Enzyme design. Structure first.
Site, short mmCIF file in Angstrom:
data_model
loop_
_atom_site.label_atom_id
_atom_site.label_comp_id
_atom_site.label_asym_id
_atom_site.label_seq_id
_atom_site.Cartn_x
_atom_site.Cartn_y
_atom_site.Cartn_z
N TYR A 87 -11.20 -28.97 -9.88
CA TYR A 87 -12.02 -28.78 -11.06
C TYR A 87 -12.65 -27.40 -11.08
O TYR A 87 -13.29 -26.99 -10.11
CB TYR A 87 -13.06 -29.92 -11.19
CG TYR A 87 -14.24 -29.64 -12.09
CD1 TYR A 87 -14.10 -29.59 -13.48
CD2 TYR A 87 -15.52 -29.47 -11.56
CE1 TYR A 87 -15.20 -29.33 -14.30
CE2 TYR A 87 -16.62 -29.24 -12.38
CZ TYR A 87 -16.45 -29.16 -13.75
OH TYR A 87 -17.54 -28.91 -14.55
N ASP A 131 4.11 -18.45 -17.72
CA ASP A 131 3.17 -18.75 -18.80
C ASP A 131 1.76 -18.24 -18.50
O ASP A 131 0.80 -19.01 -18.52
CB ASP A 131 3.18 -20.26 -19.11
CG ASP A 131 2.64 -20.66 -20.47
OD1 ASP A 131 2.61 -19.81 -21.38
OD2 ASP A 131 2.27 -21.85 -20.63
N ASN A 136 -4.30 -20.98 -19.51
CA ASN A 136 -3.87 -21.38 -18.17
C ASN A 136 -4.69 -20.73 -17.07
O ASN A 136 -4.48 -21.03 -15.89
CB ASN A 136 -2.37 -21.15 -17.98
CG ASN A 136 -1.49 -21.91 -18.95
OD1 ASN A 136 -1.91 -22.83 -19.68
ND2 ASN A 136 -0.23 -21.53 -18.98
N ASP A 149 -1.74 -24.91 -14.59
CA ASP A 149 -0.60 -25.37 -15.40
C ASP A 149 0.72 -24.69 -15.03
O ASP A 149 1.28 -23.91 -15.82
CB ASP A 149 -0.91 -25.27 -16.92
CG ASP A 149 -2.28 -25.76 -17.34
OD1 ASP A 149 -3.01 -24.97 -17.98
OD2 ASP A 149 -2.62 -26.92 -17.05
C1 NRM Z 1 -17.68 -26.49 -18.18
C2 NRM Z 1 -16.21 -26.74 -18.18
C3 NRM Z 1 -15.42 -26.88 -17.04
C4 NRM Z 1 -14.09 -27.10 -17.33
N1 NRM Z 1 -13.09 -27.30 -16.41
C5 NRM Z 1 -11.75 -27.38 -16.76
N2 NRM Z 1 -11.37 -27.27 -18.10
C6 NRM Z 1 -10.08 -27.31 -18.52
C7 NRM Z 1 -9.09 -27.48 -17.53
N3 NRM Z 1 -9.44 -27.57 -16.21
C8 NRM Z 1 -8.58 -27.75 -15.14
C9 NRM Z 1 -7.06 -27.81 -15.13
C10 NRM Z 1 -6.20 -27.00 -15.87
N4 NRM Z 1 -4.93 -27.32 -15.59
N5 NRM Z 1 -4.93 -28.32 -14.69
C11 NRM Z 1 -6.22 -28.64 -14.40
C12 NRM Z 1 -9.48 -27.77 -14.06
N6 NRM Z 1 -10.80 -27.64 -14.42
C13 NRM Z 1 -10.73 -27.53 -15.80
S1 NRM Z 1 -13.99 -27.12 -19.06
N7 NRM Z 1 -15.51 -26.85 -19.35
#
Ligand code: NRM
Length: 263
Positions: A87, A131, A136, A149
């Site tokens: 994350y 990509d 991403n 990704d």
């Molecule tokens: C405050 C906040 C934190 C976010 N964290 C994330 N947003 C979108 C995608 N994320 C992935 C991810 C992308 N591809 N596979 C996994 C991992 N952590 C995020 S969004 N807003």
């Protein structure tokens, strides 16, 4: 190493995707906060990406870098496929860009070195992301860039034209017209991003697909007044039609504008 859906508590939807979305998740036993890429089996077969997903999992699980989103493990059920990814607390570079409109020379150069370092690791293991786009790229607690990704990622110089349609804004000439692509694809995408980070829009952004195709094929981009000579130079060197003319990742890291502006 054996996972199930009942071992996790699902939270906020972090981002929207094509075959499924990204959700915030906590592992009950450890209280571990992570990201879950829930992808429906039905949509995967009805597009023929099941092998590319296996290539994504095979690649991302073995890659270990502070600027590449770690893939902890995976599982599936009678409906969906689940990817246990790390994350990124500060979200996407896409939102970061939408919020700020454009970035300063410091932020652009810091992101460029971080991305280059992660690509230098990727290319040393002969892995190409292909990509490279703000959608991403993610941000850790320290505000560090994180590549995610790895869906269209391939090993060796390949011909497996995967992105095909969708936005071609970040795909080099070779990729858009078949011709076997290598590590240089990411070097092109790097310049597209360096331009986008400073200008707020991609160098070849047109109104239509066929329109963008022309601009990518002829390599036709024009810098605004607020773009520095140092910045213009790095972008001009990166955005060359011929792949052998593009520099090695080390030259990018060495570049005067990069060292004078990075952190
Ligand atoms: C405050 C906040 C934190 C976010 N964290 C994330 N947003 C979108 C995608 N994320 C992935 C991810 C992308 N591809 N596979 C996994 C991992 N952590 C995020 S969004 N807003």
């Amino acid at each position: 190493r054996q996972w199930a859906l009942e071992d996790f508590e699902i939270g906020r939807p972090l981002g929207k995707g094509k075959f499924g979305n990204v959700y915030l998740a906590r592992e009950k036993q450890s209280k571990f906060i992570l990201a879950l890429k829930v992808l429906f089996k039905a949509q995967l077969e009805k597009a023929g990406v099941e092998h590319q997903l296996r290539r994504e999992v095979e690649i991302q699980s073995h890659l270990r870098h502070p600027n590449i989103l770690r893939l902890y493990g995976y599982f599936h059920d009678a409906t969906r496929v689940y990817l246990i990814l790390e994350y990124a607390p500060l979200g996407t570079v896409y939102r970061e860009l939408q919020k700020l409109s454009k970035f300063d020379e410091q932020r652009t150069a810091t992101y460029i070195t971080e991305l280059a370092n992660a690509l230098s690791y990727c290319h040393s293991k002969r892995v190409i992301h292909r990509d490279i786009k703000p959608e991403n790229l993610l941000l850790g607690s320290a505000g560090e860039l994180k590549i995610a990704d790895f869906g269209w990622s391939v090993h060796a110089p390949s011909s497996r034209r995967a992105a095909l349609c969708g936005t071609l804004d970040y795909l080099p000439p070779e990729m858009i017209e078949g011709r076997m692509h290598d590590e240089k694809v990411d070097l092109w995408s790097l310049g597209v991003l360096c331009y986008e980070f400073l200008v707020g829009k991609p160098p070849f952004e047109a109104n239509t697909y066929q329109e963008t195709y022309k601009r990518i094929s002829r390599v036709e981009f024009t810098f605004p007044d607020f773009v520095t000579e140092g910045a213009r130079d790095l972008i001009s060197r990166l955005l060359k039609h011929n792949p052998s003319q593009r520099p090695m990742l080390r030259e990018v890291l060495e570049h005067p504008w990069i060292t004078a502006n990075s952190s």
